[PDB]
Enzyme design. Structure first.
Site, PDB file in Angstrom:
ATOM      1  N   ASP A  33       0.863  -1.278   0.003  1.00 38.10           N
ATOM      2  CA  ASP A  33      -0.095  -0.010  -0.065  1.00 38.10           C
ATOM      3  C   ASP A  33       0.964   1.296  -0.013  1.00 38.10           C
ATOM      4  OD1 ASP A  33      -2.389   1.651  -0.028  1.00 38.10           O
ATOM      5  OD2 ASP A  33      -2.459   1.838   2.377  1.00 38.10           O
ATOM      6  N   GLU A  59       1.830  -2.709  -5.160  1.00 35.00           N
ATOM      7  CA  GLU A  59       1.325  -1.410  -5.109  1.00 35.00           C
ATOM      8  C   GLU A  59       2.321  -0.431  -4.442  1.00 35.00           C
ATOM      9  OE1 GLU A  59      -3.349  -2.247  -3.900  1.00 35.00           O
ATOM     10  OE2 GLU A  59      -2.393  -0.004  -3.577  1.00 35.00           O
ATOM     11  N   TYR A 134       0.856  -7.486  -9.702  1.00 34.53           N
ATOM     12  CA  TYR A 134      -0.386  -6.955  -9.053  1.00 34.53           C
ATOM     13  C   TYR A 134      -1.525  -6.868 -10.113  1.00 34.53           C
ATOM     14  CZ  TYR A 134      -3.136  -2.866  -7.049  1.00 34.53           C
ATOM     15  OH  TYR A 134      -4.206  -2.172  -6.853  1.00 34.53           O
ATOM     16  N   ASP A 173      -0.751 -10.261  -5.427  1.00 33.00           N
ATOM     17  CA  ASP A 173      -1.885  -9.742  -5.109  1.00 33.00           C
ATOM     18  C   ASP A 173      -2.675 -10.017  -6.534  1.00 33.00           C
ATOM     19  OD1 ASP A 173      -4.327  -8.503  -4.641  1.00 33.00           O
ATOM     20  OD2 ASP A 173      -3.679  -6.618  -4.103  1.00 33.00           O
ATOM     21  N   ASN A 175      -5.888 -10.182  -6.778  1.00 34.89           N
ATOM     22  CA  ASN A 175      -7.192  -9.490  -6.673  1.00 34.89           C
ATOM     23  C   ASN A 175      -8.485 -10.078  -7.103  1.00 34.89           C
ATOM     24  OD1 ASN A 175      -7.435  -6.578  -5.908  1.00 34.89           O
ATOM     25  ND2 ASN A 175      -5.978  -6.086  -7.442  1.00 34.89           N
ATOM     26  N   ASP A 246      -3.965 -12.601  -1.955  1.00 37.76           N
ATOM     27  CA  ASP A 246      -2.594 -12.973  -2.010  1.00 37.76           C
ATOM     28  C   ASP A 246      -2.075 -14.186  -2.073  1.00 37.76           C
ATOM     29  OD1 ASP A 246      -1.335  -9.759  -2.069  1.00 37.76           O
ATOM     30  OD2 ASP A 246      -2.719 -10.334  -0.313  1.00 37.76           O
ATOM     31  N   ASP A 271      -2.675  -2.773   4.454  1.00 43.74           N
ATOM     32  CA  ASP A 271      -3.987  -3.326   4.496  1.00 43.74           C
ATOM     33  C   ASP A 271      -3.857  -4.912   4.128  1.00 43.74           C
ATOM     34  OD1 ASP A 271      -3.868  -2.582   1.920  1.00 43.74           O
ATOM     35  OD2 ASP A 271      -5.858  -1.614   1.931  1.00 43.74           O
ATOM     36  N   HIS A 272      -2.815  -5.171   3.587  1.00 44.85           N
ATOM     37  CA  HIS A 272      -2.441  -6.602   3.248  1.00 44.85           C
ATOM     38  C   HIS A 272      -1.353  -6.941   4.228  1.00 44.85           C
ATOM     39  CE1 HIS A 272      -4.375  -6.973  -0.750  1.00 44.85           C
ATOM     40  NE2 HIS A 272      -4.262  -5.622  -0.647  1.00 44.85           N
TER      41      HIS A 272
END
Length: 281
Positions: A33, A59, A134, A173, A175, A246, A271-272
Site C-alpha cells: 500500500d 502497489e 499486481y 496480489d 485481486n 495474495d 492493509d494486506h
C-alpha cells in the site's frame, strides 16, 4: 454488521519437504500500500526479521526514479528490480528484491495493452522462473471488470508460455478470493470487485490452464478464516473480516518441493499482510 471476530492462527512454519529436504528458498510477497508509507510504518524492520531470500512487493505507488533511500539498508536483498506505470505516475507498481541476481529479469507480459501499469516482474533462476504480479482491480461499480477479463486471459496465456519452459512460481496480489472459504463475507460480495463470478472463474481457468496449484489451499484445503487483506475501514482487521487476495501458485512439478505456504497475519504496515513460501529446491 453480521460478523464478529473469527479466530485464525497460522500454523507453525513447516520448513522440511514431504520427503525430508530442508527448505532452500524462502520467498515473501507483500502488497505494501505504498512503498513510502510502508517504509515509514517499519515494513523493512519486519522484512529483516523475516530474512527472505526473495521479497516481492506490490502497489509500490512509486516512480522507479523516486525510490526511497531506505531501500539501501537491505544488504541481504541487494539485487532490486522495479516496474512502475509507464506514464511515470505514482500508482500501482511492483518490486522484486533478491539475495542472488536472477539469470534474467523482464517486465510485463509481452502485450503492450497490458504492460503500461507496472504490474509484472519476471525473474528467471536456474531451476525455476518467478513472477510477481499486481492484478488489475475490477473497480468500483465493476467499471474495470471487462478490462480485467481481458487481462486475465492475456496473463494466463503468458504464464502458460513460461511454464512450458521452466517450473513456475507466481506470487502477489491476484485481486480475487477464489472460493467462498477465501473471504469472510461471500454472500455480500458476489457483485463487488474481488468476488465476481467472472474473477473467480478466471482464477479457476488460471489453475487448470497453466496449470498451477494454490500452494496454501493445497496444504490447508479445509482451513477457513485465513485472509491476507482487510479494509482499513470498519475495524475489519480486528474482527478478521478479510479476503485472501495474495497467493503463491506453483507448477505441479514443484509440489514435491513445497514445504509450507504461510500467512503472516500479525505483520503490520499495510492493509494486506505478507505471505511466505518455503521451497526445497
Amino acid at each position: 454488521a453480521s460478523e464478529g471476530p473469527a479466530l485464525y492462527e497460522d500454523p507453525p512454519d513447516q520448513k522440511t519437504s514431504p520427503s525430508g529436504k530442508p527448505a532452500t528458498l524462502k520467498i515473501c510477497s507483500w502488497n505494501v500500500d505504498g512503498l513510502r508509507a510502508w517504509i515509514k510504518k517499519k515494513g523493512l524492520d519486519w522484512v529483516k526479521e523475516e530474512a527472505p531470500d526473495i521479497l516481492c512487493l506490490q502497489e509500490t505507488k512509486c516512480s522507479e526514479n523516486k525510490l526511497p533511500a531506505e531501500l539501501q539498508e537491505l544488504p541481504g536483498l541487494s539485487h532490486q528490480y522495479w516496474s512502475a506505470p509507464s506514464d511515470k505516475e505514482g500508482y500501482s507498481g511492483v518490486g522484486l528484491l533478491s539475495r542472488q541476481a536472477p539469470l534474467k529479469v523482464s517486465y510485463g507480459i509481452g502485450d503492450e495493452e497490458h504492460d503500461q501499469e507496472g504490474r509484472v516482474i519476471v525473474a528467471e533462476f536456474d531451476s525455476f522462473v518467478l513472477v510477481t504480479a499486481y492484478v488489475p482491480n475490477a473497480g468500483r461499480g465493476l467499471v474495470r471488470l471487462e478490462y480485467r477479463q481481458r487481462w486475465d486471459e492475456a496473463f494466463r496465456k503468458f504464464l502458460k508460455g513460461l511454464a512450458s519452459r521452466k517450473p513456475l512460481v507466481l506470487c502477489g496480489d491476484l485481486n480475487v478470493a477464489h472460493e467462498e472459504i477465501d473471504l469472510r463475507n461471500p454472500k455480500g460480495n458476489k457483485k463487488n470487485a474481488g468476488f465476481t463470478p467472472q474473477e473467480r472463474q478466471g482464477f479457476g481457468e488460471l489453475l487448470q490452464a497453466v496449470p498451477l496449484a494454490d500452494s496454501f489451499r493445497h496444504l490447508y484445503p479445509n482451513t477457513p478464516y485465513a485472509y491476507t487483506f482487510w479494509t482499513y475501514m470498519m475495524n475489519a482487521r480486528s474482527k478478521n473480516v478479510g479476503w485472501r487476495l495474495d497467493y503463491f501458485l506453483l507448477s505441479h512439478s514443484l509440489l514435491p518441493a513445497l514445504c509450507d505456504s504461510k500467512i503472516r497475519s500479525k505483520a503490520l504496515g499495510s492493509d494486506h499482510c505478507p505471505i511466505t513460501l518455503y521451497l526445497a529446491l
